[PDB]
mmCIF file of C-alpha atoms and ligand atoms in Angstrom:
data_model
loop_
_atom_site.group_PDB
_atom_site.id
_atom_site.type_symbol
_atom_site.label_atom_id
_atom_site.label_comp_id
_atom_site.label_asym_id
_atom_site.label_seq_id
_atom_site.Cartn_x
_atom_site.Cartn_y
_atom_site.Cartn_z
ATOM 1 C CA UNK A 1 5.939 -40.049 -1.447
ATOM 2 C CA UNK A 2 7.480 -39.104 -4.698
ATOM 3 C CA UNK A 3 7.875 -37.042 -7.442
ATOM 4 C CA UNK A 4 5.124 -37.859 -10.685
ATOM 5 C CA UNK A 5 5.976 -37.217 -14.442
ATOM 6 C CA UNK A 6 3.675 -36.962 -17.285
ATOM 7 C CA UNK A 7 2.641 -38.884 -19.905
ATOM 8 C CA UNK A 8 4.511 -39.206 -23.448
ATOM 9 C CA UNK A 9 1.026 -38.574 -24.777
ATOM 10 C CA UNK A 10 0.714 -35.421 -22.239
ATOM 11 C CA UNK A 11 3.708 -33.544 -23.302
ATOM 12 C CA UNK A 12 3.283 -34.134 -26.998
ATOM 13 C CA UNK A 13 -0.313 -33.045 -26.938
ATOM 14 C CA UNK A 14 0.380 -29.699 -25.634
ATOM 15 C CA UNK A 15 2.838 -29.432 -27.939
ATOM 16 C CA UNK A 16 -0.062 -29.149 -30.672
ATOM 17 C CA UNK A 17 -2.184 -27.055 -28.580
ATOM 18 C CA UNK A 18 -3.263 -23.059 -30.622
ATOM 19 C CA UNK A 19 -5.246 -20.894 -28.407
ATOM 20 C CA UNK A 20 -8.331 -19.958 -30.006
ATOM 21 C CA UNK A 21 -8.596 -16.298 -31.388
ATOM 22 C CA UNK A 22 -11.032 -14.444 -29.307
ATOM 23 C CA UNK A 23 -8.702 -15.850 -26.041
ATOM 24 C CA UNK A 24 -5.841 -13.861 -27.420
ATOM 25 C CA UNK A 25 -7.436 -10.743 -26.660
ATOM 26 C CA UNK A 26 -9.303 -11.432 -23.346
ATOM 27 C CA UNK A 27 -6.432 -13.330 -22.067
ATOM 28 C CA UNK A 28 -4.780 -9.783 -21.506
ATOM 29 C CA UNK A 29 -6.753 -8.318 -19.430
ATOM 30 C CA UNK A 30 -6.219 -8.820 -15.858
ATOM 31 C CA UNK A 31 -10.331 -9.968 -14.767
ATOM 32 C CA UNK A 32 -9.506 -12.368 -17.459
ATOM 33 C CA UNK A 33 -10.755 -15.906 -15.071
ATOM 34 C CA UNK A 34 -9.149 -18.686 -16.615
ATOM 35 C CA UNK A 35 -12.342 -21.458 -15.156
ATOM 36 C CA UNK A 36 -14.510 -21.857 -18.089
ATOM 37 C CA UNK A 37 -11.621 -23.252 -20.085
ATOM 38 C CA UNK A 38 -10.224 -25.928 -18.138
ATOM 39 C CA UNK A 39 -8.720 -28.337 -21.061
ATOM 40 C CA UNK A 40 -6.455 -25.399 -22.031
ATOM 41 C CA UNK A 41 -5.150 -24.553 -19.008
ATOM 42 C CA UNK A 42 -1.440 -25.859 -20.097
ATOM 43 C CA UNK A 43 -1.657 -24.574 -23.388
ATOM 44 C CA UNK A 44 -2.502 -21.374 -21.676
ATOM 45 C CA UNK A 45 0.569 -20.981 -20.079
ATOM 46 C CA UNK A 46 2.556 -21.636 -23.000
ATOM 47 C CA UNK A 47 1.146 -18.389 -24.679
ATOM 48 C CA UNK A 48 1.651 -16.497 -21.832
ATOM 49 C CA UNK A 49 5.196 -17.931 -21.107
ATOM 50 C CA UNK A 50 5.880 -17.073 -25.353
ATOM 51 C CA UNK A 51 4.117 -13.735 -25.213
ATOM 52 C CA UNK A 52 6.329 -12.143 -22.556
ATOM 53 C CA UNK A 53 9.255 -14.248 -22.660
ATOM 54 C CA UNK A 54 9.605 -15.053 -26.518
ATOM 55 C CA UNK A 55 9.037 -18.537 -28.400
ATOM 56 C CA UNK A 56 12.383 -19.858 -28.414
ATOM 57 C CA UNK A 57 12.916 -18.751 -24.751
ATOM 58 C CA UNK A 58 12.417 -22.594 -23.559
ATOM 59 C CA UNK A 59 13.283 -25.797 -25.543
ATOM 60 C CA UNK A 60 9.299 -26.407 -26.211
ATOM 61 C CA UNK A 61 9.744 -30.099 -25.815
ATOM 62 C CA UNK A 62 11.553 -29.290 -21.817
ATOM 63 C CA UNK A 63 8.867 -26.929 -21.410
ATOM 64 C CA UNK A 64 5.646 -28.809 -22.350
ATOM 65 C CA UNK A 65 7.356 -31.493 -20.221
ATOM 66 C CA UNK A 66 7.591 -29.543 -17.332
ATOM 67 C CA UNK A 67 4.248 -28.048 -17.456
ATOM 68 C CA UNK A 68 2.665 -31.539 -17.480
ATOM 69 C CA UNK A 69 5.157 -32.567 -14.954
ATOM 70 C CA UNK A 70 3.914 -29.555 -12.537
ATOM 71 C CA UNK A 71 -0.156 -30.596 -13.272
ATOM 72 C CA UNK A 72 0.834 -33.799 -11.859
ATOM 73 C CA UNK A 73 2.466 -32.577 -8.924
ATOM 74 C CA UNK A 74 -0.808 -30.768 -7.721
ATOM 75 C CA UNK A 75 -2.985 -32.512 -5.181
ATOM 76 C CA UNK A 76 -6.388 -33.343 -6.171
ATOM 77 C CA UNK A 77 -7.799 -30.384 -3.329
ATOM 78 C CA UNK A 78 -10.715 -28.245 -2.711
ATOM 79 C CA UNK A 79 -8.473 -24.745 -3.770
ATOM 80 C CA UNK A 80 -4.276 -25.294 -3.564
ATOM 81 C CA UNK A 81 -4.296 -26.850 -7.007
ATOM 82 C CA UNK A 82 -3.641 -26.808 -10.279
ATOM 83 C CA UNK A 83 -6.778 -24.394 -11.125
ATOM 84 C CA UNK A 84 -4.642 -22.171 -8.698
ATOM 85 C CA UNK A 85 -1.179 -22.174 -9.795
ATOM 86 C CA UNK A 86 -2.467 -21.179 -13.638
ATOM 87 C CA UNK A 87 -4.473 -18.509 -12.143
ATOM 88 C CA UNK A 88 -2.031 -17.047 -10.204
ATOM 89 C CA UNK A 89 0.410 -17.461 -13.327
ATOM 90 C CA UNK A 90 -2.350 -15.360 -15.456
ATOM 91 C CA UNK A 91 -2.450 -12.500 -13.050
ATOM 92 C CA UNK A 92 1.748 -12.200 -12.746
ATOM 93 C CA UNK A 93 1.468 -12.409 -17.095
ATOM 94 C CA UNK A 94 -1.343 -9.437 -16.809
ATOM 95 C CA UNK A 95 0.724 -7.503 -14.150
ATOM 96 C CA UNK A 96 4.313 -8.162 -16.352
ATOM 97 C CA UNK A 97 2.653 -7.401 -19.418
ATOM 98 C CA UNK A 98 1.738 -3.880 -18.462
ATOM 99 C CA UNK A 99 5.079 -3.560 -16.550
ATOM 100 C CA UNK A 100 6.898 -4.974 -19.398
ATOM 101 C CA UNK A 101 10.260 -3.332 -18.987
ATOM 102 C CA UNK A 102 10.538 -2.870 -15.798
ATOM 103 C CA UNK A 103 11.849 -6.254 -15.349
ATOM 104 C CA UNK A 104 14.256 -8.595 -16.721
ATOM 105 C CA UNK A 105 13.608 -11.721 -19.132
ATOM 106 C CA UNK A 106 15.191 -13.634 -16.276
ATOM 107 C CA UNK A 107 13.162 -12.095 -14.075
ATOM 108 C CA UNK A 108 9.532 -12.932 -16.775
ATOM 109 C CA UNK A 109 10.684 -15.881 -17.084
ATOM 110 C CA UNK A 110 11.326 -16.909 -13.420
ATOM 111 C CA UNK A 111 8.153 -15.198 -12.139
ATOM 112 C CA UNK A 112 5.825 -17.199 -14.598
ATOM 113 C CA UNK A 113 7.559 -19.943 -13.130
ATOM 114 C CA UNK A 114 7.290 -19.506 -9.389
ATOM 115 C CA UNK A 115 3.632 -18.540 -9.945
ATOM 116 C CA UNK A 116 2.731 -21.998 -11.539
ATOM 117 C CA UNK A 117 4.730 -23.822 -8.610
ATOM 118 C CA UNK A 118 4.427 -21.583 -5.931
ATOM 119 C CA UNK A 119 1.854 -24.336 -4.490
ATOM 120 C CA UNK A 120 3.353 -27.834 -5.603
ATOM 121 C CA UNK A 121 2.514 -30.590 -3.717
ATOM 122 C CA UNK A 122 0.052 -28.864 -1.428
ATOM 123 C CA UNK A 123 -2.016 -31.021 0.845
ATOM 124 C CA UNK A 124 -4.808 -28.679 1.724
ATOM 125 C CA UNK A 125 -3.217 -28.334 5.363
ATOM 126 C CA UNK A 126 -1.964 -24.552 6.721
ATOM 127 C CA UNK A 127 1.554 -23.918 7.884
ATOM 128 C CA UNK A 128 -0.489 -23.188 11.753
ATOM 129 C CA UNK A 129 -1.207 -26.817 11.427
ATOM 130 C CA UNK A 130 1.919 -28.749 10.166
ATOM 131 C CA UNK A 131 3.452 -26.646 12.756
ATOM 132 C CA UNK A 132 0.818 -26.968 15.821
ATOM 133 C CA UNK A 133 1.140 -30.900 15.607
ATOM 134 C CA UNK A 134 4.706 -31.198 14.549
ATOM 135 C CA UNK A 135 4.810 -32.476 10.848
ATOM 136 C CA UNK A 136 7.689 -33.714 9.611
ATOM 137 C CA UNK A 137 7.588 -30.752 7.622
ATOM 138 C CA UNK A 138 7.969 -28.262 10.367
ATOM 139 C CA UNK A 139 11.048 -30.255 11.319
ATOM 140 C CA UNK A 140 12.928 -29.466 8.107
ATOM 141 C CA UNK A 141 11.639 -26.326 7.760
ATOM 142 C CA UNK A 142 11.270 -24.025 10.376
ATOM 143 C CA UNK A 143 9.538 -20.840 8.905
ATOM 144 C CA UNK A 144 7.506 -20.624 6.085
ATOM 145 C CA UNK A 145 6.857 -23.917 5.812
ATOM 146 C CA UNK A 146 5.013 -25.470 2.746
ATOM 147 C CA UNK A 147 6.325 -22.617 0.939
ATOM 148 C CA UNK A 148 10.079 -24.217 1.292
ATOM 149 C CA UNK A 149 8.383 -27.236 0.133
ATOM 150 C CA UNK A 150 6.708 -25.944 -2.675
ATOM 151 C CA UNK A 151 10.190 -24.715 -3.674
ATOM 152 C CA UNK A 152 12.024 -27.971 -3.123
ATOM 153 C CA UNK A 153 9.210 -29.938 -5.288
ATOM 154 C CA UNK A 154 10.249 -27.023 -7.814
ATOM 155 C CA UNK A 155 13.901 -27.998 -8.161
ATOM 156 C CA UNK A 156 12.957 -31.493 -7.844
ATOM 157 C CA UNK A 157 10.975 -31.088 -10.734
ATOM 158 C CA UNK A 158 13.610 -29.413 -12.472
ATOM 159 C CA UNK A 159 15.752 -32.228 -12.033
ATOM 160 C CA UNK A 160 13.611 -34.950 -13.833
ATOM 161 C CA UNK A 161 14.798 -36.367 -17.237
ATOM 162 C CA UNK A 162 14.528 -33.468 -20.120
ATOM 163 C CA UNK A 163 12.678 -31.251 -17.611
ATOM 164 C CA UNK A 164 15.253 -28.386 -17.027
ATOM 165 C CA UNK A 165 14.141 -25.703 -18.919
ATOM 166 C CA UNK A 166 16.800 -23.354 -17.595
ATOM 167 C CA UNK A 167 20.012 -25.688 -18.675
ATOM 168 C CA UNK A 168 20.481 -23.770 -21.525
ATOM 169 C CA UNK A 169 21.547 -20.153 -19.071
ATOM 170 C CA UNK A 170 24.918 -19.306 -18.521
ATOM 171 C CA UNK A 171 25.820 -20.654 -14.961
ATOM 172 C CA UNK A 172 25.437 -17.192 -14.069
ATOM 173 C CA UNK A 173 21.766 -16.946 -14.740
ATOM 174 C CA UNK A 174 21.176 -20.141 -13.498
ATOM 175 C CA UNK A 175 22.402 -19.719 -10.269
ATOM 176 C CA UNK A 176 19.852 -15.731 -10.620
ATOM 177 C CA UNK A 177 16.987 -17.336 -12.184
ATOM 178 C CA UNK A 178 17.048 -20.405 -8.879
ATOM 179 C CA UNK A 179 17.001 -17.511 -6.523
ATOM 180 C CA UNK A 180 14.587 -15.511 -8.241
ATOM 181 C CA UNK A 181 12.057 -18.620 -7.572
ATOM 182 C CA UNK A 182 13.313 -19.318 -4.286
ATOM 183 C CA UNK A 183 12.355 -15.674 -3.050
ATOM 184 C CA UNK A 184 9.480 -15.483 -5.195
ATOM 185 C CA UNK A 185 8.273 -19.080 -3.531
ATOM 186 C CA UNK A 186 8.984 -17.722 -0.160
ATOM 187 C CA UNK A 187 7.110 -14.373 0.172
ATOM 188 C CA UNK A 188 3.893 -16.403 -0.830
ATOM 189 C CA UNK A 189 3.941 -16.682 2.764
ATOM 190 C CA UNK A 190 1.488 -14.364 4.075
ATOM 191 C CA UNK A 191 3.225 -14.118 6.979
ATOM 192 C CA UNK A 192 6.216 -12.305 5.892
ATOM 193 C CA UNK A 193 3.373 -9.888 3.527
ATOM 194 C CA UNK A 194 2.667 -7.554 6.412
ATOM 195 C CA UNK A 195 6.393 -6.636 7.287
ATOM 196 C CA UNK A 196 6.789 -6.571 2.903
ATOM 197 C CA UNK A 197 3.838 -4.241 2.112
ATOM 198 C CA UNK A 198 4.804 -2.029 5.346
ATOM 199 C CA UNK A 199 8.661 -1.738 4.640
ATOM 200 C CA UNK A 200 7.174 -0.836 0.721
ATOM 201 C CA UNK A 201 4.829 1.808 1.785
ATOM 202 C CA UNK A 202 7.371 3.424 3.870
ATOM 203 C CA UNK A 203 10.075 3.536 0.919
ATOM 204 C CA UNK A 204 7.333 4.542 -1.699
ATOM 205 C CA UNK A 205 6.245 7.637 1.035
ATOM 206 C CA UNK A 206 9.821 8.699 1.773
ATOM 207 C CA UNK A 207 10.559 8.645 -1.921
ATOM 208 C CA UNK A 208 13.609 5.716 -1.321
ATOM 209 C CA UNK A 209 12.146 3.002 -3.171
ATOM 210 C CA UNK A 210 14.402 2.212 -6.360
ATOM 211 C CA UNK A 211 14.189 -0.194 -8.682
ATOM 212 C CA UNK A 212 17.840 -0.587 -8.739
ATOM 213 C CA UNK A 213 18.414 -1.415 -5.617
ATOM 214 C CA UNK A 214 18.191 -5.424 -5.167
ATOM 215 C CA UNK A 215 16.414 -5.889 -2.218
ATOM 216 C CA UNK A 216 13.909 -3.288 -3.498
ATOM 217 C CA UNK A 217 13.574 -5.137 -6.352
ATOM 218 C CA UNK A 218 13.102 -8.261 -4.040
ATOM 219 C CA UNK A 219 10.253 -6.851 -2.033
ATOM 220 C CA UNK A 220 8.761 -5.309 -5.064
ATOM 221 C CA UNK A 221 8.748 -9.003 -6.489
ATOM 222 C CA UNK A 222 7.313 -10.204 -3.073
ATOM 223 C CA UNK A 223 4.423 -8.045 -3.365
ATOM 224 C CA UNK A 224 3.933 -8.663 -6.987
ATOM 225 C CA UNK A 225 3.423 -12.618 -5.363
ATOM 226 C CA UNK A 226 0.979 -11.815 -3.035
ATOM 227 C CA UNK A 227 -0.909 -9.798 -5.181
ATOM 228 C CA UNK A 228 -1.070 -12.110 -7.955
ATOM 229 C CA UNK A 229 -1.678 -15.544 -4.694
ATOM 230 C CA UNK A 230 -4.700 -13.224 -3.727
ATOM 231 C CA UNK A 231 -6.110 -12.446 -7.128
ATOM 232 C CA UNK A 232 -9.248 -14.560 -6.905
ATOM 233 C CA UNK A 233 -10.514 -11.162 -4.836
ATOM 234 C CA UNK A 234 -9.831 -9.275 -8.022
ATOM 235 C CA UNK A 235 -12.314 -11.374 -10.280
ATOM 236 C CA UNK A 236 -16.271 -10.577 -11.091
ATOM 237 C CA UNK A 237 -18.138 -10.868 -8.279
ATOM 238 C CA UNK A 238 -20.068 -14.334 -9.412
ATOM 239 C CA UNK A 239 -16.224 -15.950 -9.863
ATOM 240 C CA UNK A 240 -15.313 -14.640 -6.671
ATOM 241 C CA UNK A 241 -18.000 -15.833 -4.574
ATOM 242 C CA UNK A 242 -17.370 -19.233 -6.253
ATOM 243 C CA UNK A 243 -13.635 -19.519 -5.628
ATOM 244 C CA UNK A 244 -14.470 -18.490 -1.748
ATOM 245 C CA UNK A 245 -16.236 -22.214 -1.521
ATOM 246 C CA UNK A 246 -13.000 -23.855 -2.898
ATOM 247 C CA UNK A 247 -11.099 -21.732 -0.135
ATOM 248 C CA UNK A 248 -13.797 -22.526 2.538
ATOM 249 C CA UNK A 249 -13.549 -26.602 1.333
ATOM 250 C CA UNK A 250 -10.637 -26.728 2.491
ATOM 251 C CA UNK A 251 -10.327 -25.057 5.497
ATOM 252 C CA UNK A 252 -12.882 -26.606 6.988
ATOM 253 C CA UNK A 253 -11.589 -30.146 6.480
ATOM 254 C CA UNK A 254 -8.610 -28.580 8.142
ATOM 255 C CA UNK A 255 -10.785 -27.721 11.359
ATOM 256 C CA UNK A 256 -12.550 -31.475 11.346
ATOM 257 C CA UNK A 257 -8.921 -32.659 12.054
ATOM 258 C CA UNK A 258 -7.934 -30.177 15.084
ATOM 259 C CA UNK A 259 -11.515 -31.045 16.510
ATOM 260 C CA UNK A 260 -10.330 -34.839 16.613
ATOM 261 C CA UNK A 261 -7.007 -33.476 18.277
ATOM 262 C CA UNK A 262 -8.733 -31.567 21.251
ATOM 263 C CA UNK A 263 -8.941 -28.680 19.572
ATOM 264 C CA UNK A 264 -11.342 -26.049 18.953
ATOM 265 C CA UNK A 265 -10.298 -24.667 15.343
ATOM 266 C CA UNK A 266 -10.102 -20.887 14.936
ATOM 267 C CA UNK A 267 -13.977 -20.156 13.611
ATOM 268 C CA UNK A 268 -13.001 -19.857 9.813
ATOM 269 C CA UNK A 269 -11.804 -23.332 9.925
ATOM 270 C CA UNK A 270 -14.718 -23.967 11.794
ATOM 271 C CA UNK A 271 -17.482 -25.608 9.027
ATOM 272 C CA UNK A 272 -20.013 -24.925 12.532
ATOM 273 C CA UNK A 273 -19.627 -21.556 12.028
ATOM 274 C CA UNK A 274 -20.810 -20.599 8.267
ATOM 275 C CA UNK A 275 -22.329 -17.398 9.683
ATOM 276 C CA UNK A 276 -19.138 -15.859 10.447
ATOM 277 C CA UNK A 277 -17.619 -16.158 7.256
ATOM 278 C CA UNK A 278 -19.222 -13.097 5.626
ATOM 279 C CA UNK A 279 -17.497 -11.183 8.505
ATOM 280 C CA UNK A 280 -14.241 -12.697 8.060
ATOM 281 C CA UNK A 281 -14.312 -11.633 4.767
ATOM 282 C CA UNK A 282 -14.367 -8.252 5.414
ATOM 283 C CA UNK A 283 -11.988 -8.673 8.079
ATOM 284 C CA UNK A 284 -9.316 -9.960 5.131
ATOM 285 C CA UNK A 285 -9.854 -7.522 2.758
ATOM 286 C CA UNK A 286 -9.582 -4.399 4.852
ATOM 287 C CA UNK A 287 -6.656 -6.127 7.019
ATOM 288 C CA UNK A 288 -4.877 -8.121 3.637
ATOM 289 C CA UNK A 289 -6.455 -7.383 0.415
ATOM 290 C CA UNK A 290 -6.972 -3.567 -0.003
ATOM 291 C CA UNK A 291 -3.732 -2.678 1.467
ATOM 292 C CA UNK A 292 -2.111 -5.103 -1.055
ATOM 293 C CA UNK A 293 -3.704 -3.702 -4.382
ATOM 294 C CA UNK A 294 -3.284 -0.454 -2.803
ATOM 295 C CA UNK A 295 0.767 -0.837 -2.146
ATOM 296 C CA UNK A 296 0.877 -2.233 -5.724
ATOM 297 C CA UNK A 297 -1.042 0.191 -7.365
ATOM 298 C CA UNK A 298 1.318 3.365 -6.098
ATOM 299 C CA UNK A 299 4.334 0.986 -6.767
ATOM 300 C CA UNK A 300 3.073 0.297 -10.062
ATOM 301 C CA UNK A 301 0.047 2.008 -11.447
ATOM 302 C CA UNK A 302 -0.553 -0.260 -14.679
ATOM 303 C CA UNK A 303 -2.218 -2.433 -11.599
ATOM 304 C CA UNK A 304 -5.004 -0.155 -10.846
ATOM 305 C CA UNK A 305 -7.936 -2.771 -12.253
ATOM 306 C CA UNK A 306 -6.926 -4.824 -9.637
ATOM 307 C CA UNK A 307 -7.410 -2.571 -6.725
ATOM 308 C CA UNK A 308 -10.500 -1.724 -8.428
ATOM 309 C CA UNK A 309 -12.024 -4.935 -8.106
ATOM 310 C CA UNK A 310 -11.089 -5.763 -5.143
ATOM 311 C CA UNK A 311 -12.788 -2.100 -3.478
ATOM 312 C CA UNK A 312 -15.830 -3.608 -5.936
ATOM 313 C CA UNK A 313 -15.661 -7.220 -4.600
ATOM 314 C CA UNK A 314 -15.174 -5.586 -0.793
ATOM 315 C CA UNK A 315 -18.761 -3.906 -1.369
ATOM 316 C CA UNK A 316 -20.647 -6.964 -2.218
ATOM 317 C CA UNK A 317 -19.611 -8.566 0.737
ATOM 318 C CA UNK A 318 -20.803 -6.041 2.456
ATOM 319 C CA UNK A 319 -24.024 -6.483 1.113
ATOM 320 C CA UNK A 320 -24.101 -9.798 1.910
ATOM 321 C CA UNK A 321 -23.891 -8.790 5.772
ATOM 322 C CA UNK A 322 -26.678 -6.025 5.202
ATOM 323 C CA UNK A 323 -28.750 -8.940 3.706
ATOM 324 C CA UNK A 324 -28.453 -7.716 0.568
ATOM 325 C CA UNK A 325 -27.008 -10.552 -1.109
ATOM 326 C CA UNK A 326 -29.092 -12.524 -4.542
ATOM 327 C CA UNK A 327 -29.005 -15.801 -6.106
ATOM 328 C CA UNK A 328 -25.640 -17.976 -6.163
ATOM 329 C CA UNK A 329 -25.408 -21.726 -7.190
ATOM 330 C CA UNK A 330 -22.416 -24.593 -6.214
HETATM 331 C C1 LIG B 401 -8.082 -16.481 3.808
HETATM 332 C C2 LIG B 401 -8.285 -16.134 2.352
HETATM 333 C C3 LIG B 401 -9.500 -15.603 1.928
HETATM 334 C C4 LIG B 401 -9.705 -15.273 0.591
HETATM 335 N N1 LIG B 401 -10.874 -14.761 0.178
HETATM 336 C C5 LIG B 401 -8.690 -15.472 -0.339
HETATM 337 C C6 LIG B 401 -7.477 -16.006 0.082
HETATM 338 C C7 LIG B 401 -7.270 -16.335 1.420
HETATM 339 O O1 LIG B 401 -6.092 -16.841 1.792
HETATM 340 NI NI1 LIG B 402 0.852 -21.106 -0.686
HETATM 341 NI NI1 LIG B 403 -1.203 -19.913 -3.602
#
């Protein structure tokens, strides 16, 4: 119950922070995994937010405030954390970077932004559930339900003491750059994917799509989120694997809880039923992850690497079912 704020001694410390020389370089590319460097993480973000947005973009002090502010406001879970929301942050840097111009610096700057608190506050619990046993949640929000959350923790955020890095835009922009992460926030709800990437195909295929258009623009954003939520399927194999145990974690403390309810969970919540999971992961990348990269690839074909990896990461699970599979570690 409540929004958290850092430290004086957080902020100011990241304010200090240089990124090491050989990250400069690797940090670019979009297999780039962020894991092995865990007390840079904020610091991280910085760069990337000063790379593509510029160094006097934010006040630094409002900014290093509000990254240590958003840290906080991660739960200490298995996956939906603060690991997440910078990884998702480096993939939407990787895909801007090579899309540079296409897009607005209200638009770079809001994206970076919705990516690191497209999760806030998450309590390792799906939208099925808050919604299957009534949540208070649910009750506010009707649809898309943690992700209006995750939004509202946003603005809260926003709204602490010298957090408000966006004070400083015209009304104007304010008012954009708010709606920008609200929409961004939103389609991070895989639920409304399927109709996004579908309506995209189409408008790519007829030749209608236009960048110009707003709500082109919009759904071009949306898919950009998914894309970028998903992007764990785009790493090395090894990273992958790894990041499927943080996703599994979780799930399956999510189907302990229907099982005290009466429930039988659905089998990937189901920590009984281990043996299905190399199936179900097949059954996510051909119905969810290949169509994704492969959308965002004709959209914008800078993102090839990631539909790349994905087709590579798609093959090793297979493997796994053909028995194929060598030595992993936890
Ligand atoms: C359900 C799921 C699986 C994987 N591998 C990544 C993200 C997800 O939401
Ligand atoms: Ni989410
Ligand atoms: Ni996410």
């Amino acid at each position: 119950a409540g929004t958290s704020i850092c430290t004086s001694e957080e902020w100011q410390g990241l304010m200090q922070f240089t990124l090491p020389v050989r990250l400069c370089k690797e940090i670019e590319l979009f297999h780039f995994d962020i894991g092995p460097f865990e007390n840079m993480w904020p610091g991280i973000f910085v760069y990337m937010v000063h790379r593509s947005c510029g160094t006097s973009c934010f006040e630094l002090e409002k900014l290093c405030r509000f990254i240590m502010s958003v840290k906080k406001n991660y739960r200490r879970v298995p996956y939906h954390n603060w690991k997440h929301a910078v990884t998702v942050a480096h993939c939407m840097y990787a895909i801007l970077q090579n899309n540079h111009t296409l897009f607005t610096d209200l638009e770079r700057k809001g994206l970076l932004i919705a990516c690191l608190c497209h999760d806030l506050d998450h309590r390792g619990f799906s939208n099925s559930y808050l919604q299957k046993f009534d949540h208070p949640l649910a009750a506010l929000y009707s649809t898309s339900t943690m992700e209006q959350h995750h939004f509202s923790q946003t603005v809260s955020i926003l709204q602490l003491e010298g957090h408000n890095i966006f004070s400083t835009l015209s009304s104007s922009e304010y008012e954009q750059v708010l709606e920008i992460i609200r929409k961004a926030i939103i389609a991070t709800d895989l639920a409304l994917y399927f109709g996004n990437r579908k309506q995209l195909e189409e408008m790519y295929q007829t030749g209608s799509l236009n960048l110009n258009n707003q709500s082109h623009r919009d759904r071009v954003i949306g898919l950009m989120m998914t894309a970028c939520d998903l992007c764990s399927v785009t790493k090395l194999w090894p990273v992958t694997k790894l990041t499927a145990n943080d996703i599994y974690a979780e799930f399956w403390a999510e189907g302990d809880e229907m099982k005290k309810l009466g429930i039988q969970p659905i089998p990937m919540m189901d920590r009984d039923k281990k043996d299905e999971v190399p199936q179900g992961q097949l059954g996510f990348y051909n119905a969810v992850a290949i169509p994704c990269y492969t959308t965002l690839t004709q959209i914008l074909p800078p993102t090839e690497p990631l539909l790349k990896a994905c087709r590579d990461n798609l093959s090793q699970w297979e493997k796994v079912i053909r028995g194929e599979e060598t030595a992993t570690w936890i």
